[PDB]
From TrEMBL, chain B:
GO biological process per UniProt: symbiont-mediated suppression of host TRAF-mediated signal transduction
Gene: ORF169b
Domain of life: Bacteria
Name of the molecule in the record: ORF169b
Keywords of the record: Plasmid
């Protein structure tokens, strides 16, 4: 059958009773896509921002992992220029035993505390490590530009 | 160390009601199995509730990024039972009624000392069912509550169950439980 009740149930709670700080809307044309919005956590450099994310449920979900990527630009060591997220459970640590809610909670936790232990070397990560203070000024500025007045 | 048999004594020494009983035990196990009260690892928490009630000991359940170590295989080995209708709730049925109607299906299919893995809405969430001879003890050691349908806060036994909510009882062989007791995933988990 393809665990039809699970998809309906996860979709239902994401649209009706999501994790605080997170909200979503179904994609008018494709039911497998969701338009997610995550608030910048208070006390983080992203505070005050509203970040757009795209959630896609592949045909083989949950055997296949869900796809999530930022659609709003952000200066973060764990998110690249195309909005791709470096989260172990979105990649080789995903398991059908996991849930979509776990992914969103982790992404949200990432905003409040960037993960330093990331093998993917990138310019933004190096600056957060090397120039944390300058990095934070930059992140706050990118928040005001891309994550405000954007919705 | 921790001895489940002993915890059952202290709990039985208390003339608590069925549901109030499960909740307290689950709350006890929760402090050990899932010390963070975090979400995402229910499957692992339930499996660990089962191990504990089977006498394998009490170990910290895997956190989200450790779930794929063993749970992906478990999930595949039971896909057939997870991807089924299971026990569907009746209209206007309350939580206590539904719970009782589910325990019945369990008693009528397991013996004392046994345990089961209970999938809520086809693996959206997981809890464990433990047979004690007479009654069944529903345990959610992830958040430390008794029987629930993935509820942020434990609901009243009088609350109404949402239309056609499903629950799948998952029969797990001793071969399955032993294979985990031998895995390195189980052995790397903090004891008590």
């Amino acid at each position: 059958a393809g665990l039809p009740r699970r998809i309906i149930k996860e979709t239902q709670r994401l649209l009706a009773e999501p994790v605080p700080g997170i909200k979503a809307e179904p994609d008018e044309s494709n039911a497998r896509y969701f338009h997610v919005v995550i608030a910048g956590p208070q006390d983080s450099p992203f505070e005050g921002g509203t970040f757009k994310l795209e959630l896609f449920l592949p045909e083989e979900y949950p055997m296949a992992a869900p796809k999530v990527r930022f659609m709003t630009k952000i200066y973060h060591p764990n998110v690249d220029k195309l909005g791709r997220i470096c989260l172990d459970i979105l990649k080789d640590k995903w398991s059908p035993a996991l849930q979509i809610r776990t992914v969103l909670l982790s992404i949200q936790a990432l905003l409040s505390a960037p993960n330093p232990d990331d093998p993917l070397a990138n310019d933004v990560a190096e600056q957060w490590k090397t120039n944390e203070a300058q990095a934070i000024e930059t992140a706050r500025a990118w928040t005001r530009l891309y994550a405000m007045n954007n919705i | 160390n921790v001895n489940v048999k002993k915890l059952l004594e202290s709990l039985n020494s208390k003339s608590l009601g069925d549901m109030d009983k499960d909740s307290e035990l689950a709350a006890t196990l929760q402090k050990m199995i899932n010390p963070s009260g975090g979400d995402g690892n229910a499957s692992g928490c339930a499996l660990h509730a089962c191990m504990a009630m089977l006498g394998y000991g009490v170990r910290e359940a895997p956190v989200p990024n450790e779930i794929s170590e063993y749970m992906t295989g478990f999930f595949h080995r039971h896909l057939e039972q997870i991807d089924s209708e299971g026990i569907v709730s009746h209209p206007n049925e309350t939580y206590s009624k539904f719970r009782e109607r589910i325990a019945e299906n369990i008693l009528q299919n397991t013996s004392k000392g046994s345990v089961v893995m209970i999938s809520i809405e086809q693996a959206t969430h997981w809890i464990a069912g433990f047979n004690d001879g007479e009654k069944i003890m529903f345990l959610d050691v992830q958040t430390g509550k008794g029987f629930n349908l993935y509820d942020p806060v434990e609901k009243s036994p009088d609350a109404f169950v949402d239309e056609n909510s499903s629950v799948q009882v998952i029969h797990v062989s001793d071969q399955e439980f032993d294979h985990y007791a031998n895995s390195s995933s189980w052995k790397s988990k903090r004891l008590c």
